[PDB]
């Protein structure tokens, strides 16, 4: 008949399976267009995008659920907490990069596509690439926290939940 | 029909990049130049770790030292007369 689930890349002895969750064209395109999988571009810009998303998303919970949520100063306090969390995350990223990558070693990323075509391995899995990524992450996260604060409590836009 | 090649161990063991994309940069040139210029100082991992740890510690200490009684109940202090002890102790 017609079966949907197939072995990964046609190899039945690799510990994975091809399912609509993992191999559908829409999800494949979406994952390929995320900054974490853009192999052929400077990791600094990708880290900028990642930090801009994450620091922006982190503002809400700190501002609204925090201890000073009912104070008139709740927005600034929550934004400061989100910035501190971004700083801690950047520290963790730097620690991982220092522990994982030596300066002279080449990339640990795969050099083959699913079709067996040779490609340039991702420079994100090198010391310099990871350093650029975490610097971009810090710069983007601080900017995203500041932008969320500016949109919520400097222009005071009529957001339903603030 | 065969998935075992001695000349290609990466293909044999599944060393593939599944969602990796080799497409060019989708970002605008001016924006990339701006970010490259203004994020360059943070790309030194040795400097970044020391700066983050020391500056974060100093900022935490400074903010804790500048907190008022409105922000922290511990800074406000007691406002009520103290309770007495079980058998007259103070």
């Amino acid at each position: 008949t017609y079966q949907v689930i197939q072995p990964i890349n046609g190899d039945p002895f690799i510990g994975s399976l091809e399912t609509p969750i993992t191999s559908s064209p829409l999800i494949a395109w979406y994952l390929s267009n995320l900054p974490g999988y853009r192999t052929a571009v400077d990791p600094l810009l990708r880290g900028i995008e990642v930090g801009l998303a994450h620091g922006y998303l982190l503002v809400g919970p700190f501002v609204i659920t925090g201890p000073l949520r009912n104070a008139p100063n709740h927005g600034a306090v929550g934004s400061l907490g989100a910035a501190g969390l971004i700083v801690i995350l950047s520290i963790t990223l730097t620690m991982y990069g220092i522990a994982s990558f030596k300066e002279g070693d080449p990339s640990t990323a795969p050099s083959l596509t699913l079709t067996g075509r040779k490609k340039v391995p991702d420079p994100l899995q090198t010391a310099d690439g990871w350093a650029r990524f975490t610097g971009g992450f810090f710069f983007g996260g601080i900017s995203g926290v500041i932008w969320a604060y500016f949109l919520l409590y400097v222009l005071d836009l009529p957001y339903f939940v603030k | 029909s065969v998935y075992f090649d001695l000349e290609d161990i990466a293909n044999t063991t599944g060393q593939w990049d599944v969602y990796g994309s080799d497409a060019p940069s989708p970002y605008n040139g001016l924006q990339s130049k701006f970010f490259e210029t203004f994020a360059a100082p943070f790309t030194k991992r040795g400097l970044l770790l020391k700066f983050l740890l020391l500056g974060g510690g100093a900022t935490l200490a400074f903010v804790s030292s500048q907190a008022t009684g409105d922000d922290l109940p511990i800074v406000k202090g007691p406002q009520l007369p103290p309770q007495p002890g079980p058998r007259g102790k103070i």
Binding site: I91, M95, I98, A99, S100 | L49, L53, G56, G57, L60, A61, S64, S65, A67, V75
Partner: peptide, 29 residues
Amino acid sequence: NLPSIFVPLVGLVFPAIAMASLFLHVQKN
């Protein structure tokens, strides 16, 4: 005076620095 400065240092900053140093030590080689 001092407690407001010292408590964050001993409770947060010093453990973080020590953890980072120890992790970098144990991940060596």
